Amino acid sequence: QTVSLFIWLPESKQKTLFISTKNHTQFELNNIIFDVTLSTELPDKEPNAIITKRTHPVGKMADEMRKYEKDHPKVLFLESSAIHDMMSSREEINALLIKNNIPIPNSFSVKSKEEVIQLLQSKQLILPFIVKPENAQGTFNAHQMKIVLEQEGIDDIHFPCLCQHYINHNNKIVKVFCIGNTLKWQTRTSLPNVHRCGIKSVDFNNQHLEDILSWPEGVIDKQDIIENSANRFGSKILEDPILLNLTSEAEMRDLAYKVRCALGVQLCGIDFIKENEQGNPLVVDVNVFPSYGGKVDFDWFVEKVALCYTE
Numbered sequence: 001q002t003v004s005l006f007i008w009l010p011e012s013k014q015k016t017l018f019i020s021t022k023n024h025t026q027f028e029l030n031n032i033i034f035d036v037t038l039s040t041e042l043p044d045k046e047p048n049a050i051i052t053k054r055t056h057p058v059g060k061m062a063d064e065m066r067k068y069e070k071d072h073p074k075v076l077f078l079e080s081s082a083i084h085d086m087m088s089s090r091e092e093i094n095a096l097l098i099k100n101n102i103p104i105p106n107s108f109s110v111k112s113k114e115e116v117i118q119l120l121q122s123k124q125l126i127l128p129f130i131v132k133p134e135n136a137q138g139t140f141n142a143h144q145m146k147i148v149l150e151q152e153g154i155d156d157i158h159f160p161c162l163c164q165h166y167i168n169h170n171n172k173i174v175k176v177f178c179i180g181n182t183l184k185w186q187t188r189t190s191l192p193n194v195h196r197c198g199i200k201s202v203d204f205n206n207q208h209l210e211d212i213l214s215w216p217e218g219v220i221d222k223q224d225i226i227e228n229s230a231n232r233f234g235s236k237i238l239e240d241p242i243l244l245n246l247t248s249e250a251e252m253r254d255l256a257y258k259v260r261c262a263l264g265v266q267l268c269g270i271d272f273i274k275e276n277e278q279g280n281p282l283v284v285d286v287n288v289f290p291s292y293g294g295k296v297d298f299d300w301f302v303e304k305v306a307l308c309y310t311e
């Protein structure tokens, strides 16, 4: 049998994802011949599957994608508009993680200050908490976060948003990247442990972690400032998370399978932290069609996508 896979990505994503690219490649895997084409535009001819990351939630690509899916229902999308839409919502993703018994830090989707006030007063939402925009993908603003340290720190929150209990996790995050059952993982620096010294809130954009250099004194321990300032608090690669005794291969594979099943997704990245580096993985973010650590071999990626397709 023959299977055609069409990778539909803008040059921007192609540049970050692949060491080098090929316009067309052909290979055999498990007695199937795979023909793989990479293009910035939709296929003129209908393939068996389209492999794609939608760049922005609204715009030309989004519109083209929805139309193509409606008019070619037999084409498998990795990943579909519906999957992108669900995964662009903190509320929807966390509802599914909760429904599927996947540990997360305690989380609440809110639309106003009154709601946050009620959650604090009833002792459901515990300080400190991080505030993440409800729309989680596609803009600079989607990554603009606030850490609320005291009740007064709610005053400038942008709604709607996810309020999620802030975990002191010793500045290590585990990233698990999936192409279906094929995994790649790593540890990176994350955010420092925070202190409730009287400062009411601090702000940072995850794309601009140098913001943390400007936080008022007392929020971060002096030694943590020393240890992270040379790198401008940037997301830096650390040793392998198994070697660090942070997790195990079996734990990562189990978690990744559970998340993929809960969300109905094959191409995803899962971020998890552990309170004081111990106990349950706490999922803080799941991304559709991630960077895979940046710059992977094209032939590797396509073989693993083909493997996923067969499964």
Ligand SMILES: Nc1ncnc2c1ncn2[C@@H]1O[C@H](COP(=O)(O)OP(=O)(O)O)[C@@H](O)[C@H]1O
Residues within 6 Å of the ligand: 105, 130, 132, 136, 142, 143, 164, 165, 166, 167, 168, 169, 173, 189, 190, 191, 206, 207, 271, 284, 285
């Ligand atoms: N509940 C939390 N407690 C502590 N740190 C967190 C929490 N959630 C996220 N973070 C930190 O904030 C960063 C950005 O949050 P994340 O949800 O991953 O958003 P993004 O979509 O910008 O990657 C994470 O990489 C991690 O360093």
Ligand SMILES: [Mg+2]
Residues within 6 Å of the ligand: 271, 285
């Ligand atoms: Mg993340």
